[PDB]
Design an enzyme around this catalytic site. Structure first.
Site, short mmCIF file in Angstrom:
data_model
loop_
_atom_site.label_atom_id
_atom_site.label_comp_id
_atom_site.label_asym_id
_atom_site.label_seq_id
_atom_site.Cartn_x
_atom_site.Cartn_y
_atom_site.Cartn_z
N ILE A 15 -30.69 -9.70 6.88
CA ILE A 15 -31.58 -10.03 7.91
C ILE A 15 -31.16 -9.97 9.44
CG2 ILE A 15 -32.72 -12.31 8.85
CD1 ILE A 15 -32.06 -13.66 5.99
N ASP B 16 -21.41 -33.53 4.02
CA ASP B 16 -20.63 -32.81 4.89
C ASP B 16 -19.59 -33.56 5.55
OD1 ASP B 16 -19.88 -30.33 6.46
OD2 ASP B 16 -21.38 -31.04 8.10
N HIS C 108 -20.07 -30.56 10.28
CA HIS C 108 -20.58 -29.11 10.75
C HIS C 108 -21.99 -29.67 11.34
CE1 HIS C 108 -17.73 -28.04 7.47
NE2 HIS C 108 -17.47 -27.16 8.30
N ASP D 81 -21.17 -13.19 21.84
CA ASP D 81 -22.34 -14.04 22.06
C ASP D 81 -21.91 -15.54 21.79
OD1 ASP D 81 -22.39 -14.58 19.01
OD2 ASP D 81 -22.90 -12.70 19.20
N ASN E 212 -18.79 -7.36 21.36
CA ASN E 212 -20.03 -7.72 21.30
C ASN E 212 -20.33 -9.28 21.45
OD1 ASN E 212 -22.13 -5.64 21.09
ND2 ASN E 212 -21.13 -4.92 19.30
N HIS F 55 -8.32 -24.43 13.69
CA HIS F 55 -8.12 -25.45 12.77
C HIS F 55 -6.44 -25.78 12.85
CE1 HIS F 55 -11.74 -26.70 11.79
NE2 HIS F 55 -12.06 -25.73 10.92
N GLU G 290 -14.52 -29.36 14.26
CA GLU G 290 -15.39 -28.47 14.09
C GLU G 290 -15.81 -27.69 15.32
OE1 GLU G 290 -15.80 -26.43 11.52
OE2 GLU G 290 -14.60 -27.55 10.31
N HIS H 196 -11.99 -19.17 14.54
CA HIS H 196 -12.38 -20.64 14.12
C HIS H 196 -11.30 -21.37 13.32
CE1 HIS H 196 -15.57 -23.84 12.64
NE2 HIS H 196 -14.64 -23.93 11.76
N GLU H 197 -11.10 -20.57 12.13
CA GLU H 197 -10.34 -21.28 11.25
C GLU H 197 -8.95 -21.25 11.50
OE1 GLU H 197 -11.21 -22.68 8.87
OE2 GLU H 197 -13.17 -21.84 8.93
N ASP I 254 0.83 -1.16 0.15
CA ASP I 254 0.05 0.07 -0.13
C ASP I 254 0.82 1.19 -0.12
OD1 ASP I 254 -1.67 2.14 2.02
OD2 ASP I 254 -2.87 1.10 0.56
N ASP J 80 -29.91 -13.32 12.99
CA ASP J 80 -29.49 -14.60 12.77
C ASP J 80 -27.99 -15.05 12.61
OD1 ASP J 80 -29.09 -13.64 10.67
OD2 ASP J 80 -29.63 -14.81 9.07
N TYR K 154 -10.87 -35.08 9.84
CA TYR K 154 -12.00 -34.11 9.03
C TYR K 154 -13.24 -35.19 8.61
CZ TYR K 154 -13.80 -29.69 8.68
OH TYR K 154 -14.44 -28.44 8.48
N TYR L 113 -22.74 -12.80 8.21
CA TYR L 113 -23.75 -13.68 7.56
C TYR L 113 -25.20 -12.94 7.10
CZ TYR L 113 -26.55 -17.94 6.81
OH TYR L 113 -27.59 -18.83 6.38
N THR L 114 -25.66 -13.15 6.11
CA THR L 114 -26.81 -12.40 5.54
C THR L 114 -27.00 -11.04 5.98
OG1 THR L 114 -28.10 -13.54 7.29
CG2 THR L 114 -28.03 -14.86 5.27
CA LIG Z 1 -27.86 -11.81 9.24
CA LIG Z 2 -3.67 3.31 1.02
CA LIG Z 3 -20.37 -14.94 17.57
CA LIG Z 4 -20.97 -11.45 18.36
ZN LIG Z 5 -14.11 -25.31 10.64
#
Ligand SMILES: [Ca+2]
Ligand SMILES: [Ca+2]
Ligand SMILES: [Ca+2]
Ligand SMILES: [Ca+2]
Ligand SMILES: [Zn+2]
Length: 316
Positions: free
Chosen positions: A197, A226, A231, A185, A183, A146, A166, A142-143, A57, A200, A157, A193-194
């Site tokens: 919405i 899977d 999963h 949870d 935040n 692994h 997993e 999470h990743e 950069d 969720d 796996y 995700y989505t």
């Molecule tokens: Ca969502």
């Molecule tokens: Ca820049």
């Molecule tokens: Ca979370």
């Molecule tokens: Ca969260």
């Molecule tokens: Zn995973």
């Protein structure tokens, strides 16, 4: 790259501004020299060839919308490294300060992220099911967990060991999200995700059945999809970990919670000292009981809670 360590600033996927560790040498690169042998973020430029080019950069200010996924991948790998170092005294994923590498902008419209055995890879999402996946700290952790598993227990796996694999990644991804106090949870992937919405997420640890995943061993998936449900059947273990931590009554079994910190100490010990490549749920229960026994004594409340939690999800 060989250069001078410095600090740049940018905005992540959700629009939040953060400082990131960069390296200066003609360009400013996403290379953080302050943690182990370094954290390196690459641009895969919408292709599937890896790793792509170390992110360069011109002025050390990463506010372009193309930069956002790189900012967060870079930043959240540093937070995950700090969590394992500070809480579990582990230096990087191999225990020897191995360099952490991530590529972002992988492929086109790719709705996933993964540890491929050598580095992390993040798609940008199609903008409807997901936005750029590195915007979720529980996804990055999470990743990256692994990689930790691969160097320690080595859980294969598929079928029950893959489901354990997993769940371990959902558990530590969640614990890293509480450690960063972003935040927090017990849901997985809710920040990315989505985007259309609210409320969720991909999976829930506190109530896996909300999205159709099993929350009891009698509801496990036995088919072949899977990888044998890695999963899907991880919901049974996630529910058990949520109960050990938080407590509750499940299918008539009451569990006294012992908190997140002890949860993390028991599972980290089980993972690095007792689980093996083919462990299955019943051996996870024994590993976790033995770990809690090692740490708190065989007549502690901690050991009692680990047994009630696995009894509550039907794992003997
Ligand atoms: Ca969502
Ligand atoms: Ca820049
Ligand atoms: Ca979370
Ligand atoms: Ca969260
Ligand atoms: Zn995973």
């Amino acid at each position: 790259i060989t250069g001078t360590s410095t600090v740049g600033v940018g905005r992540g996927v959700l629009g939040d501004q953060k400082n990131i560790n960069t390296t200066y040498s003609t360009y400013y690169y996403l290379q953080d020299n302050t943690r182990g042998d370094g954290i390196f973020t690459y641009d895969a430029k919408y292709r599937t060839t890896l790793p792509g080019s170390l992110w360069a950069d011109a002025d050390n200010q990463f506010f372009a919308s193309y930069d956002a996924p790189a900012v967060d991948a870079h930043y959240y790998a540093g937070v995950t490294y700090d969590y394992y170092k500070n809480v579990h005294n582990r230096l990087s994923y191999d225990g020897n300060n191995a360099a952490i590498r991530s590529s972002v902008h992988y492929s086109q419209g790719y709705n996933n992220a993964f540890w491929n055995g050598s580095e992390m890879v993040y798609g940008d999402g199609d903008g409807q099911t997901f936005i750029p996946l590195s915007g979720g700290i529980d996804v990055v952790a999470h990743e990256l967990t692994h990689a930790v598993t691969d160097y320690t227990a080595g859980l294969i796996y598929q079928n029950e060991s893959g489901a354990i694999n997993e769940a371990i990644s959902d558990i530590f991804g969640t614990l890293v999200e509480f450690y960063a106090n972003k935040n927090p949870d017990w849901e997985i992937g809710e920040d990315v995700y989505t985007p259309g919405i609210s409320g969720d997420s991909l999976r829930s640890m506190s109530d896996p059945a909300k999205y159709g995943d099993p929350d009891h061993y009698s509801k496990r998936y036995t088919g072949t999809q899977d990888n044998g449900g890695v999963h899907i059947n991880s919901g049974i273990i996630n529910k058990a970990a949520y109960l050990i931590s938080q407590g509750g009554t499940h299918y008539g079994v009451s569990v006294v919670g012992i908190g997140r910190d002890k949860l993390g100490k028991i599972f980290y010990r089980a993972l690095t000292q007792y689980l093996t490549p083919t462990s299955n749920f019943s051996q996870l229960r024994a590993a976790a009981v033995q770990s809690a026994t090692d740490l708190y004594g065989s007549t502690s409340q901690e050991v009692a809670s680990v047994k009630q939690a696995f009894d509550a999800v039907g794992v003997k």
